[PDB]
Protein backbone atom coordinates (compact mmCIF):
# COMPACT_ATOMS: atom_id res chain seq x y z
CA UNK A 1 0.00 0.00 0.00
CA UNK A 2 1.05 3.81 0.89
CA UNK A 3 3.68 4.36 3.77
CA UNK A 4 4.27 7.41 5.28
CA UNK A 5 7.60 6.27 7.96
CA UNK A 6 8.54 9.74 9.98
CA UNK A 7 12.25 9.36 11.60
CA UNK A 8 14.83 12.23 13.42
CA UNK A 9 13.12 12.59 16.41
CA UNK A 10 14.25 12.41 19.79
CA UNK A 11 14.81 14.18 23.28
CA UNK A 12 16.80 17.24 22.91
CA UNK A 13 17.83 20.82 24.99
CA UNK A 14 16.06 24.11 24.43
CA UNK A 15 18.03 26.25 21.85
CA UNK A 16 18.90 22.57 19.91
CA UNK A 17 18.21 21.28 16.36
CA UNK A 18 16.73 18.64 14.99
CA UNK A 19 15.84 17.46 11.64
CA UNK A 20 12.92 15.12 11.03
CA UNK A 21 12.40 13.35 7.45
CA UNK A 22 9.18 11.64 6.11
CA UNK A 23 10.06 8.97 3.66
CA UNK A 24 7.32 7.99 1.09
CA UNK A 25 6.22 4.16 -0.11
CA UNK A 26 4.13 4.12 -3.09
CA UNK A 27 3.62 7.52 -3.27
CA UNK A 28 5.75 10.51 -5.21
CA UNK A 29 5.99 13.42 -3.08
CA UNK A 30 6.86 15.80 -5.50
CA UNK A 31 3.44 16.01 -6.94
CA UNK A 32 0.80 16.65 -4.27
CA UNK A 33 0.57 18.57 -1.23
CA UNK A 34 2.42 17.31 1.91
CA UNK A 35 2.66 18.38 5.36
CA UNK A 36 3.42 18.15 9.10
CA UNK A 37 1.15 18.96 12.07
CA UNK A 38 2.00 18.35 15.39
CA UNK A 39 -0.34 17.36 18.86
CA UNK A 40 0.75 18.45 21.97
CA UNK A 41 -0.06 16.56 25.08
CA UNK A 42 -3.40 18.01 26.60
CA UNK A 43 -3.81 19.92 23.74
CA UNK A 44 -5.48 19.88 19.86
CA UNK A 45 -3.46 18.68 16.88
CA UNK A 46 -2.08 21.97 14.98
CA UNK A 47 -0.78 22.68 11.49
CA UNK A 48 2.92 23.56 11.18
CA UNK A 49 3.71 23.40 7.66
CA UNK A 50 2.96 22.21 3.88
CA UNK A 51 4.78 21.73 0.65
CA UNK A 52 3.72 21.85 -2.88
CA UNK A 53 6.67 21.52 -5.26
CA UNK A 54 8.55 25.23 -5.25
CA UNK A 55 5.80 26.39 -2.32
CA UNK A 56 5.83 26.50 0.91
CA UNK A 57 3.54 27.36 3.95
CA UNK A 58 4.51 27.66 8.14
CA UNK A 59 2.28 27.91 10.95
CA UNK A 60 2.69 31.19 12.68
CA UNK A 61 4.32 29.99 15.66
CA UNK A 62 7.28 28.44 13.96
CA UNK A 63 7.88 30.64 10.58
CA UNK A 64 11.36 31.81 10.44
CA UNK A 65 12.38 28.44 12.48
CA UNK A 66 11.45 25.58 10.84
CA UNK A 67 11.86 24.98 6.64
CA UNK A 68 10.04 22.38 5.41
CA UNK A 69 11.91 20.87 2.17
CA UNK A 70 12.00 17.91 -0.23
CA UNK A 71 14.33 15.42 -2.21
CA UNK A 72 12.64 13.88 -4.78
CA UNK A 73 15.46 11.65 -5.57
CA UNK A 74 14.76 10.01 -2.05
CA UNK A 75 11.18 10.65 -1.95
CA UNK A 76 11.77 12.00 1.09
CA UNK A 77 10.12 15.20 2.91
CA UNK A 78 12.12 16.98 5.51
CA UNK A 79 11.42 19.07 8.52
CA UNK A 80 14.58 21.31 9.46
CA UNK A 81 13.89 22.57 13.09
CA UNK A 82 15.88 25.25 14.57
CA UNK A 83 15.90 27.06 17.90
CA UNK A 84 13.47 24.86 19.72
CA UNK A 85 11.78 25.68 22.79
CA UNK A 86 9.94 23.10 25.59
CA UNK A 87 6.48 24.57 23.54
CA UNK A 88 7.90 22.80 20.30
CA UNK A 89 7.46 19.28 22.14
CA UNK A 90 4.60 17.17 21.14
CA UNK A 91 4.21 14.18 18.28
CA UNK A 92 5.20 15.14 14.66
CA UNK A 93 3.01 13.69 12.21
CA UNK A 94 3.73 13.02 8.50
CA UNK A 95 0.57 13.61 5.79
CA UNK A 96 -0.05 13.48 2.26
CA UNK A 97 -2.85 14.72 0.27
CA UNK A 98 -4.27 13.53 -2.76
CA UNK A 99 -4.11 17.04 -3.98
CA UNK A 100 -2.13 19.08 -6.06
CA UNK A 101 -3.96 22.72 -5.35
CA UNK A 102 -1.39 25.49 -3.48
CA UNK A 103 -4.34 27.42 -2.90
CA UNK A 104 -5.66 24.22 -0.77
CA UNK A 105 -2.23 23.25 0.33
CA UNK A 106 -2.09 27.00 1.68
CA UNK A 107 -4.73 26.37 4.38
CA UNK A 108 -1.99 24.18 5.63
CA UNK A 109 -4.63 21.65 7.64
CA UNK A 110 -2.23 18.51 7.28
CA UNK A 111 -4.57 16.52 9.62
CA UNK A 112 -7.44 16.34 6.55
CA UNK A 113 -4.58 14.80 4.25
CA UNK A 114 -5.76 11.12 2.98
CA UNK A 115 -2.44 9.45 4.27
CA UNK A 116 -0.73 10.05 8.01
CA UNK A 117 2.26 8.49 9.00
CA UNK A 118 2.62 7.17 12.60
CA UNK A 119 4.55 10.20 13.97
CA UNK A 120 7.50 10.96 16.00
CA UNK A 121 8.30 11.82 19.58
CA UNK A 122 10.03 15.73 19.64
CA UNK A 123 10.82 16.41 23.19
CA UNK A 124 12.66 19.31 24.32
CA UNK A 125 13.49 20.22 27.43
CA UNK A 126 14.42 23.30 29.12
Known amino acids: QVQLVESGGGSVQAGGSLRLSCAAS????????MGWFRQAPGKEREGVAT??????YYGDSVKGRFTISQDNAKNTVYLQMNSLKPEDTAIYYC?????????????????????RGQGTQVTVSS
Open 95 to 115: AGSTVASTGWCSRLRPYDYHY
Open 26 to 33: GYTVSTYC
Open 51 to 56: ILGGST
